[PDB]
């Protein structure tokens, strides 16, 4: 889990020059999920 | 049979994809219909 | 893009009354300027609220991830 | 409300009464040399150069990106970057001085000469103000 | 009893039209702004969020949370954050609220307010439910979805009154007029050709003897008789947004007389 793919949504990842493809979609797109640090917010 | 340059194309028009494209088919190529 | 919750002029709530109001339209085949009124939405300021907004959200849904 | 300005409720203004979202989008690529000299994303420090950004550096995920959950704002850094010259001269991008807000989505792509092509976008929720126009 | 009376007129359990009777015009007013800005009331003010993927983004849910009516009829027994002495907050301060939705369906899953689930302890007392007037009781819908479109928050509502924002106000909208038959010539209507025709006459008309031209213009003539109106959101039961509203202006009142004391010392 890091990135991901725009169309055919799947977690993926990886790390220096592996390609910059998807496992399937060639679409080389790829965003990059969420953060784990929760984030907070003031509610107005 | 030869290759000579690129050709810019205008959106919605007849040689772009869009132009036959339908409701559907469009919010799955993430265009805005 | 989702109904106001609460009137921006009396804060009164108007988050629930959306589904219903969108039945006493399609379903119950009424009239907006009555189905408000059904609603409690007495004065204006609640009224301009539903009878206005364009919950373009759905067509924002129809997308993907 | 003189002179062409208005009063505005307040109330309203927080029952939700003209709120806005703002998206930005810097962008960045990895220079390419015709003689194999490369540039990187990642999250650097001294090692020789020093010629480095003045805000956090921090928020730098490994690859040389934010995730999109972050809070961002200040100069915090967006993007880690160095460009290779004899060796670790920055070269990463600020959020501009003035604004602040969330990092919204982040992507990675290739650009037809096989480059590392990247964006990153802020999102920021503006409640209406008092010098405000409309 | 002894001083300024009333008598309802009709009344609910969103509205309580009424009449205030022998009371001053500033106090008849003091009291509606009391009513309508600094009575306690609960609602979200912290949205931790762990992960969204619906359409709306963070903060834009966030605000609405804050709006989703909360319960408060015994606000009055639990503290403000900023008072109690916490690192931060507790079930003494605060109540703690969860939501998660995934959608399953494939059509569109709804997200309602009714979907809140409070965590902390509410150590017995009426606070913190998710107030509904829904018909089908949902209320408020939150957010919608569609595939694998998750949303897992996590709230903190505390204390707090209209002054810090809106989303703490438990009144909004308040009916209130007087003299309905301009006896105190306190309005002079515009009018094209006639006053009387043009400007339509109120409800309020009736319940109050007509003008009757001869008789002079009644200078010492000052104001008693409102008629209000004071409907309510839930949060609070609409009596009590008139109770406690008559009360807070009580305290307020009282304060002066208490710092007006501590400062007799010296
Ligand atoms: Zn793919
Ligand atoms: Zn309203
Ligand atoms: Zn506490």
Redesign the pocket.
């Given at each position: 889990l890091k990135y991901i793919?725009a169309?055919?949504s799947?977690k993926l990842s990886l790390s220096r020059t592996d390609a910059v493809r998807?496992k399937?979609?060639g679409?080389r797109i790829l965003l990059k999920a969420r953060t784990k640090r929760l984030v907070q917010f003031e509610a107005r | 049979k030869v290759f000579i340059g690129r050709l810019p194309i205008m959106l919605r028009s007849k040689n772009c994809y869009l132009s036959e494209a339908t409701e559907s088919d469009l919010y799955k190529l993430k265009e805005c219909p | 893009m989702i109904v106001p919750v609460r009137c921006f002029s009396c804060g009164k709530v108007v988050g629930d009354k959306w589904e219903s109001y969108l039945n006493l339209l399609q379903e119950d085949e009424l009239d907006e300027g009555t189905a408000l009124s059904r609603l409690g939405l007495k004065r204006y300021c609640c009224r301009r609220m539903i009878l206005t907004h364009v919950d373009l959200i759905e067509k924002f849904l129809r997308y993907n991830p | 409300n003189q002179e062409d300005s208005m009063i505005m409720n307040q109330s309203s203004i927080d029952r939700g009464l003209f709120r806005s979202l703002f998206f930005r989008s810097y962008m960045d690529q990895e220079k390419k040399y015709g003689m194999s000299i490369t540039e990187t994303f990642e999250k650097p420090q001294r090692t020789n150069t020093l010629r480095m950004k003045h805000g956090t550096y921090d928020k730098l995920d490994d690859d040389g990106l934010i995730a999109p959950g972050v809070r961002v704002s200040g100069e915090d850094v967006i993007i880690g970057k160095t460009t290779p010259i004899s060796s670790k001269r920055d070269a990463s991008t600020p959020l501009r001085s003035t604004e602040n807000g969330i990092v919204d989505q982040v992507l990675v792509t290739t650009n037809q000469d096989g480059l590392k092509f990247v964006k990153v976008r802020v999102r920021t929720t503006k409640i209406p103000q008092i010098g405000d126009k409309f | 009893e002894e001083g300024p009376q009333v008598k309802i007129r009709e009344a609910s359990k969103d509205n309580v039209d009424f009449i205030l009777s022998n009371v001053d015009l500033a106090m008849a007013n003091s009291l509606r702004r009391v009513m309508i800005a600094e009575i306690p009331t609960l609602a979200i003010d912290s949205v931790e969020v762990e992960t969204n993927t619906t359409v709306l983004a963070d903060e834009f849910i966030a605000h609405r949370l804050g709006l989703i009516p909360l319960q408060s009829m015994d606000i009055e027994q639990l503290e403000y954050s900023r008072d109690c002495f916490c690192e931060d907050h507790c079930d003494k301060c605060s109540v703690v609220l969860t939501l998660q939705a995934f959608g399953e369906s494939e059509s569109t899953t709804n997200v309602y307010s009714k979907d809140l689930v409070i965590v902390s302890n509410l150590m017995g007392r009426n606070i913190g439910h998710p107030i509904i007037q829904d018909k089908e009781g949902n209320g408020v819908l939150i957010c919608k979805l569609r595939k694998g479109q998750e949303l897992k928050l996590t709230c903190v509502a505390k204390k707090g009154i209209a002054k810090e924002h809106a989303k703490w106000g438990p009144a909004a909208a308040i009916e209130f007029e007087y003299d309905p038959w301009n006896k105190l010539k306190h309005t002079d209507y515009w009018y094209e050709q006639d006053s009387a025709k043009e400007w339509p006459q109120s409800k309020n008309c009736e319940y109050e003897d007509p003008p009757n031209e001869g008789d002079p213009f009644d200078y010492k003539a000052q104001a008693d008789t409102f008629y209000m109106n004071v409907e309510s959101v839930g949060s609070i039961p609409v009596d009590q947004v008139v109770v406690r509203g008559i009360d807070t202006l009580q305290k307020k009142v009282a304060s002066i007389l208490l710092a007006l004391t501590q400062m007799d010392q010296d």
């Open positions: 793919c169309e055919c799947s998807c399937d979609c679409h | - | - | - | -």
